[PDB]
Design a binder for these strands. Structure first.
Ligand SMILES: [Cl-]
Ligand SMILES: [Cl-]
Ligand SMILES: [Cl-]
Ligand SMILES: [Cl-]
Ligand SMILES: [Cl-]
Ligand SMILES: [Cl-]
Ligand SMILES: [K+]
Ligand SMILES: [Mg+2]
Ligand SMILES: [Mg+2]
Ligand SMILES: [Mg+2]
Ligand SMILES: [Mg+2]
Ligand SMILES: [Mg+2]
Ligand SMILES: [Mg+2]
Ligand SMILES: [Mg+2]
Ligand SMILES: [Mg+2]
Ligand SMILES: [Mg+2]
Ligand SMILES: [Mg+2]
Ligand SMILES: [Mg+2]
Ligand SMILES: [Mg+2]
Ligand SMILES: [Mg+2]
Ligand SMILES: [Mg+2]
Ligand SMILES: [Mg+2]
Ligand SMILES: [Mg+2]
Ligand SMILES: [Mg+2]
Ligand SMILES: [Mg+2]
Ligand SMILES: [Mg+2]
Ligand SMILES: [Mg+2]
Ligand SMILES: [Mg+2]
Ligand SMILES: [Mg+2]
Ligand SMILES: [Mg+2]
Ligand SMILES: [Mg+2]
Ligand SMILES: [Mg+2]
Ligand code: NA
Ligand code: NA
Ligand code: NA
Ligand code: NA
Ligand code: NA
Ligand code: NA
Ligand code: NA
Ligand code: NA
Ligand code: NA
Ligand code: NA
Ligand code: NA
Ligand code: NA
Ligand code: NA
Ligand code: NA
Ligand code: NA
Ligand code: NA
Ligand code: NA
Ligand code: NA
Ligand code: NA
Ligand code: NA
Ligand code: NA
Ligand SMILES: [Sr+2]
Ligand SMILES: [Sr+2]
Ligand SMILES: [Sr+2]
Ligand SMILES: [Sr+2]
Ligand SMILES: [Sr+2]
Ligand SMILES: [Sr+2]
Ligand SMILES: [Sr+2]
Ligand SMILES: [Sr+2]
Ligand SMILES: [Sr+2]
Ligand SMILES: [Sr+2]
Ligand SMILES: [Sr+2]
Ligand SMILES: [Sr+2]
Ligand SMILES: [Sr+2]
Ligand SMILES: [Sr+2]
Ligand SMILES: [Sr+2]
Ligand SMILES: [Sr+2]
Ligand SMILES: [Sr+2]
Ligand SMILES: [Sr+2]
Ligand SMILES: [Sr+2]
Ligand SMILES: [Sr+2]
Ligand SMILES: [Sr+2]
Ligand SMILES: [Sr+2]
Ligand SMILES: [Sr+2]
Ligand SMILES: [Sr+2]
Ligand SMILES: [Sr+2]
Lengths: 186, 154, 92, 95, 160
RNA sequence: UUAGGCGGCCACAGCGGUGGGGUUGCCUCCCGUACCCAUCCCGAACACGGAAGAUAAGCCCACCAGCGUUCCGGGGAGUACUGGAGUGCGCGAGCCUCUGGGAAACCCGGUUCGCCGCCACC
RNA sequence: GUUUGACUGGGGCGGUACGCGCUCGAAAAGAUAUCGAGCGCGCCCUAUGGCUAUCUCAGCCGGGGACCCGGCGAAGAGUGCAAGAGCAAAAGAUAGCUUGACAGUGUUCUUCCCAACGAGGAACGCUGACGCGAAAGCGUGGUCUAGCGAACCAAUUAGCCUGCUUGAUGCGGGCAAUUGAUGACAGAAAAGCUACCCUAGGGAUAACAGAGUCGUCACUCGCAAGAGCACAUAUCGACCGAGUGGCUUGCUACCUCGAUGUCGGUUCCCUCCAUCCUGCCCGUGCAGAAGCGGGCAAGGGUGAGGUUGUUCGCCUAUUA
RNA sequence: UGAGGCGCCCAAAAUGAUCGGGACUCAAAUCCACCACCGAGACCUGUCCGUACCACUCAUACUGGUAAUCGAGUAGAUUGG
RNA sequence: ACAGCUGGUUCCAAUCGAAACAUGUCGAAGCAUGACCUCCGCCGAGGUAGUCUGUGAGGUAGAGCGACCGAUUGGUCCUGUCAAACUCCAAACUUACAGACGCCGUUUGACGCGGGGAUUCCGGUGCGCGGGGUAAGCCUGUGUACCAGGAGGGGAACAACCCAGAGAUAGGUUAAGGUCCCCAAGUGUGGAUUAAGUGUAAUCCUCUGAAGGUGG
């Protein structure tokens, strides 16, 4: 920019989207990467592998395609994150993938967060992923209990549109139940 | 196809240049060889450019030199039309000369030594301290210039 | 330089990490009964005594660390390569 | 030379072209080569470890196995055969 | 010291002042003479002194030639004449002298010189068609104090 | 790719600028702290929960060349330099001829305001 | 009785280019010398090591050289120490935690290009045990290249082997490794004189002389500032530039060490000219007489004395 | 008034001057071209020798064949006399 | 007596044919280990002194620095200069590997491997590139060819400059160089210049001739 000798960062660096140092450490495993990403409204899980001209996504799941199996609830929460990982995981198993290393990109390793929920979801799908149980939120929170109790402090329904008043972590169970089942159309 | 004649001796010439001549089958002064115009052969003559005389000879001249200096791969058997006809894929010297100049075959392929051991130039040559453009005998020659030299060394 | 008197590290005896105490190696006393001692008495006489007439060599500007590492749980010590150090003081 | 250390006279060959300065892309540090593959040896100024002796920069050896993540590359120094331990970061496939 | 000792370019370039100390000061008084507040464009005539051989010119010679050149221009056009002359080269090359036989002979520093390739302009003057023959005479004196033969080439000036 | 994710090459992608785009879609800004988590002080950030509003940022789409960069034409230049050869020239430093290679600066006119791979998606 | 080292434009003195690291010399792969140019290392650090989390530095600008807020800012900061090199969601900073600065054993490269050689070093593995991290992963000290030491002997660490018919005890011998030094640093325990000298050799190496060179020395030429009351050039002549000689001095080590006898002087012979006199000229700040400067010219001449070995020189009376 | 060619001045050394000498001037100089010659052990060619290899052979005994791609040599290694 | 120091060491021929360098050394007038020479045995199909092309390595020449860095002018942006320890650029060229062509090898066994025997570790010169030095027939590098250890022809003579690498003997034709005489070949041809005996001198310790000047 300034002149001939000026050093411009790699593109994914300028864009502030890829931590190259963490990436290298990630790739050193030789295993595929369970790419966990999150939007204000959605959550995405991808099983990525290395390739000649760029990465190769072998399987994936977005929180959107969750409704596809009976989800009328929001998609930017814990239950969403877990189930999304499980779906991506299941599909991963389908394509032949058996193991992965969690790549949370620029997100923080906060204990109990959604990137970790995505990981517990993918693990339950049967994927072998180096992890740490005491960094994962406890089952109930994954179910979405924390939000139920929040709707308990009602006076005004937590959700605008009506999916339910006091919400339902039991719906989480139905969907998970539906996924762990074979029939499912991955 | 170019005709190559060594005109400068080996003493004091770079070894890699002397080896190049040997790879081109010339091991003595006045010895001549016929080389195909290929990129590979082109680098070789360019490297030996200052110790040799080269160029494309005329059909007639080639025929004169073949009749007078061509030799069998082994033996002293003289090479004439009959030899050519009874030993090569051609009818007479002319047919061989044409095939060589058109780069369809080589002296070796036809059972002939790759080298024509010429005689010193009758009337002497133009000198080995300067190139053709300067009046000397070194370097690339005219079809006519090359013919003049080869004939004087028939 | 500073050196902690105790710290956790590998004990080649227990074969696992345990607390060790570091000590500078104190010179043990000689007995005067080793073969070399007898050879000096046997080979020294009238005149020069060869190797036995030679005197102590010099000193290097700085000496290497010379410590004992004693396992706080099995009581056994082990040695390690030393490193040049002008001075070596233990912390605590 | 005035001294004989491993980095003697390596100013040029171990210095980055200004724009190639900074951490290098991870892709080539993770590349995988098969035994028998021809690979050019060239130390990457930005990568500290996994280097070979600078004197070998420019060689085009043959991968003949690996040791840990590093590769064992066969070369012929002058007339002597030598084996070089080197990581992908300092290697490039030939052709 | 004879110029025969330094006139040739038979040594590496030796100019790095970060690795050289004790460098004597240049005897060159000025590089821009005449009316330096004016542009060379404002003149009809431009004459240069061209060095015919590649050489090194010690600062002592640049000053003698330049001096004897400008000195003439001042005496012919006045200490304020309407002209301007430039010495465009600077003595960057540091010179030595080994002044103990050939043992540890790297010489001590003793001066500076400017390297000049044949065909280059050492001096360049700008005058009016009037003083054209005066600048030519100043150069005749200048080239008599520098090693090589020179050409007195007239650049802008079609008043022949 | 009517706005997404992971990338490869790592400025041809930088710097700067103009125009265009979003009712239950996407990305955002945005609203908000009971929880998981968080600030040597701040729900700013990080983390979690969520939709009243918005296309003004970002982002995506279209585009501009003034600066920086890439490549190309024409000029500089077959110049500078140079591998091989010489009973060629020069008092000499050095130069020349033949042969084989061949710049850089700079000017002028174009090019360049990324290209490509994988996955997902009215 | 011995030792008293090596390098070295001969040797001594001085120095260490005697073990190591960086830039340049080095001629764009590698390798490469000189008493080559610039300059360093013989440590320091329990953190100034390791990991993780959080974070971004010099410098400049704007608002309230310490502090606070904002903007610009690919790196000019910092990273122990030479130099060159590496590094920005870090290899830097801050915080917290930790002891991998760990044990065993290798592969490879380096040391020592090619091409054999030890100690030492590095990168990269496997095994054991650990630290931190969610995890991938990172940690075989400090971002990289200097910071180092054989055999014999001693002390030390843990276990085991062994000592002459046999048992016990004492005290020994050994396998593996750590520490203690040899810097002349791939390791002897070590001062001088010789003109009273001696031997082997060397022109492999100096002194005289020869030869090469010509900085020095001598002489010349170009330019001509300046002064010469005015006047460059009667005359004197700075600076700078270009040369010739081989009388001085220096440099080199080519010839000669199974000897080419030294300085000065003397005697006797030949020569050179850059001419001191003599011959013939030109100019003059040439009246004359005489000076001063210049030209041709080597036929002839250039002498006697005082100090001093002196050469040179100082001095005296003569002299064309 | 510019450029080029040859020459002139600048230009002094010691036993007897020199381009090897003589000596040469529309050259026996210099430069631009050209013509014809002389001139090695090189190159070509006849015969022979050695050596290496091949065929035949017990043979390293004869006989035949190949060498454009064999033929110089200090220190030194090897082998026949 | 010992010496790492000087001298000497006696018959013929055939094949090959060096090193005057690297590491270590109380080592530099010596050794050892390598490099290189040679001999024997083993192996069994490739090899690579040349060139072209492809995939890589490199920052020297040159160039340039409103590209870093540090030098270096003046004026009221412009204007004047540089770098062995500077580089936004950047050759020729050197170099790794591979394919192709060439050459070579499979009865002449190449390439590689093992073993016996050395000699050698004062080198020199030309050319190119150097560094030191005013310079040197100087000192010290580097690549190459030569002398050393290389005849014969030419260069007046003349280790390394030119031609040329050479069994014996013979005929022939050239090479460098030369053709007025000495001395084999022209008092050759067309043309121009020079009047100084310039010159009749490739290279060179060896052949000088400069700055400056010239209505020859
Ligand atoms: Cl994300
Ligand atoms: Cl200690
Ligand atoms: Cl290596
Ligand atoms: Cl015999
Ligand atoms: Cl030969
Ligand atoms: Cl005469
Ligand atoms: K002598
Ligand atoms: Mg034949
Ligand atoms: Mg001729
Ligand atoms: Mg360099
Ligand atoms: Mg808008
Ligand atoms: Mg000449
Ligand atoms: Mg004794
Ligand atoms: Mg000595
Ligand atoms: Mg190099
Ligand atoms: Mg001892
Ligand atoms: Mg001890
Ligand atoms: Mg030593
Ligand atoms: Mg050593
Ligand atoms: Mg004696
Ligand atoms: Mg001698
Ligand atoms: Mg000598
Ligand atoms: Mg006279
Ligand atoms: Mg008078
Ligand atoms: Mg006389
Ligand atoms: Mg003839
Ligand atoms: Mg014999
Ligand atoms: Mg015989
Ligand atoms: Mg340059
Ligand atoms: Mg000899
Ligand atoms: Mg005759
Ligand atoms: Mg004369
Ligand atoms: Na005894
Ligand atoms: Na990089
Ligand atoms: Na927007
Ligand atoms: Na000693
Ligand atoms: Na001294
Ligand atoms: Na070692
Ligand atoms: Na002298
Ligand atoms: Na002289
Ligand atoms: Na005398
Ligand atoms: Na006289
Ligand atoms: Na006297
Ligand atoms: Na012999
Ligand atoms: Na002795
Ligand atoms: Na030697
Ligand atoms: Na030695
Ligand atoms: Na000796
Ligand atoms: Na082949
Ligand atoms: Na050059
Ligand atoms: Na030879
Ligand atoms: Na002769
Ligand atoms: Na004459
Ligand atoms: Sr006794
Ligand atoms: Sr005693
Ligand atoms: Sr000491
Ligand atoms: Sr020089
Ligand atoms: Sr001059
Ligand atoms: Sr807020
Ligand atoms: Sr001269
Ligand atoms: Sr071209
Ligand atoms: Sr001396
Ligand atoms: Sr490290
Ligand atoms: Sr004393
Ligand atoms: Sr006495
Ligand atoms: Sr004698
Ligand atoms: Sr005279
Ligand atoms: Sr007189
Ligand atoms: Sr005196
Ligand atoms: Sr012979
Ligand atoms: Sr022979
Ligand atoms: Sr031979
Ligand atoms: Sr090179
Ligand atoms: Sr004639
Ligand atoms: Sr004529
Ligand atoms: Sr001489
Ligand atoms: Sr000359
Ligand atoms: Sr002149």
């Amino acid at each position: 920019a300034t002149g001939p000798r000026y050093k411009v960062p790699m593109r994914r660096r300028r864009e502030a989207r890829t931590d190259y140092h963490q990436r290298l450490r990630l790739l050193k495993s030789g295993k595929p990467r369970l790419v966990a990403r999150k939007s204000n409204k959605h959550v995405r899980a991808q099983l990525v592998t290395l390739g000649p001209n760029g990465d190769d996504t072998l399987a994936s799941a977005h929180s959107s395609d969750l409704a596809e199996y009976g989800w009328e609830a929001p998609t930017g929460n814990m239950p969403s994150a877990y189930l999304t990982g499980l779906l991506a995981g299941l599909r991963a198993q389908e394509a032949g993938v058996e193991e992965a290393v969690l790549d949370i990109g620029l997100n923080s390793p906060t204990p109990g967060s959604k990137v970790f929920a995505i990981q517990e979801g993918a693990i339950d799908a049967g994927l072998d992923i180096p992890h740490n149980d005491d960094v994962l939120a406890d089952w109930q929170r994954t179910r979405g209990a924390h939000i139920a109790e929040y709707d308990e402090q009602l006076e005004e329904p937590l959700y605008s549109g009506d999916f339910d008043a006091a919400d339902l972590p039991e719906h989480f169970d139905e969907l998970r139940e539906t996924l762990l089942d074979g029939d499912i159309e991955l | 196809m170019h005709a190559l004649v060594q005109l400068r001796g080996e003493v004091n010439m770079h070894t890699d240049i002397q080896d190049t001549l040997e790879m081109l089958n010339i091991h003595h002064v006045n010895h001549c060889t016929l080389v195909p115009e290929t990129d590979a052969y082109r680098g070789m003559v360019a490297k030996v450019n200052d110790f040799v005389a080269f160029g494309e000879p005329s059909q007639e001249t080639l025929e004169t030199v073949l009749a007078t200096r061509a030799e069998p791969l082994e033996g002293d058997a003289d090479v004439d039309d009959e030899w050519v006809a009874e030993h090569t894929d051609y009818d007479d010297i002319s047919g061989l000369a044409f095939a060589l100049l058109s780069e369809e075959t080589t002296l070796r392929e036809q059972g002939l030594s790759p080298t024509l051991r010429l005689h010193p130039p009758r009337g002497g040559h133009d000198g080995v301290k300067h190139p053709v453009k300067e009046g000397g005998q070194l370097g690339k020659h005219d079809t006519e210039g090359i013919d003049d030299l080869l004939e004087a060394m028939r | 330089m500073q050196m902690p008197r105790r710290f956790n590290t590998y004990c080649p005896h227990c074969n696992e990490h345990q607390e060790h105490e570091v000590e500078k190696v104190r010179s043990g006393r000689q007995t005067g009964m080793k073969w070399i001692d007898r050879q000096r008495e046997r080979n020294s006489g009238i005149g020069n005594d060869g190797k036995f007439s030679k005197v102590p060599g010099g000193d290097k500007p700085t000496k290497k660390t010379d410590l004992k590492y004693r396992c706080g749980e099995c009581g056994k010590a082990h040695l390690r390569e030393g490193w040049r150090a002008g001075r070596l003081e233990f912390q605590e | 030379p005035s001294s004989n250390g491993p980095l003697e006279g390596t100013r040029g060959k171990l210095k980055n072209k200004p724009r190639d300065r900074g951490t290098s892309p991870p892709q080539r540090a993770v590349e995988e080569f098969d035994d028998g593959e021809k690979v050019h040896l060239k130390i990457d100024p930005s990568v500290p470890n996994g280097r070979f002796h600078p004197r070998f920069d420019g060689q085009t050896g043959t991968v003949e196995g690996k040791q840990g993540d590093a590769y064992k590359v066969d070369i012929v120094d002058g007339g002597k055969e030598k084996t070089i331990i080197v990581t992908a970061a300092h290697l490039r496939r030939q052709e | 010291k004879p110029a025969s000792m330094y006139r040739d370019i038979d040594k590496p370039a030796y100019t790095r002042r970060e690795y050289i100390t004790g460098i004597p000061g240049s005897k060159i008084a000025q590089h821009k003479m005449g009316r330096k507040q004016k542009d060379a464009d404002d003149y009809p005539v431009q004459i240069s002194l061209i060095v015919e051989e590649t050489v090194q010119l010690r600062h002592g010679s640049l000053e003698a030639s330049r001096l004897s050149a400008n000195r003439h221009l001042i005496k012919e056009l006045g200490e304020e004449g309407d002209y301007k002359m430039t010495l465009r080269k600077f003595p960057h090359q540091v010179l030595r002298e080994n002044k103990d036989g050939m043992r540890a002979a790297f010489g001590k520093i003793v001066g500076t010189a400017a390297r000049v390739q044949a065909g280059e302009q050492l001096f360049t003057a700008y005058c009016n068609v009037e003083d054209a023959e005066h600048v030519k005479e100043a150069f005749r004196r200048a080239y008599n104090k520098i090693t090589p033969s020179c050409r007195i080439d007239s650049s802008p000036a079609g008043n022949a």
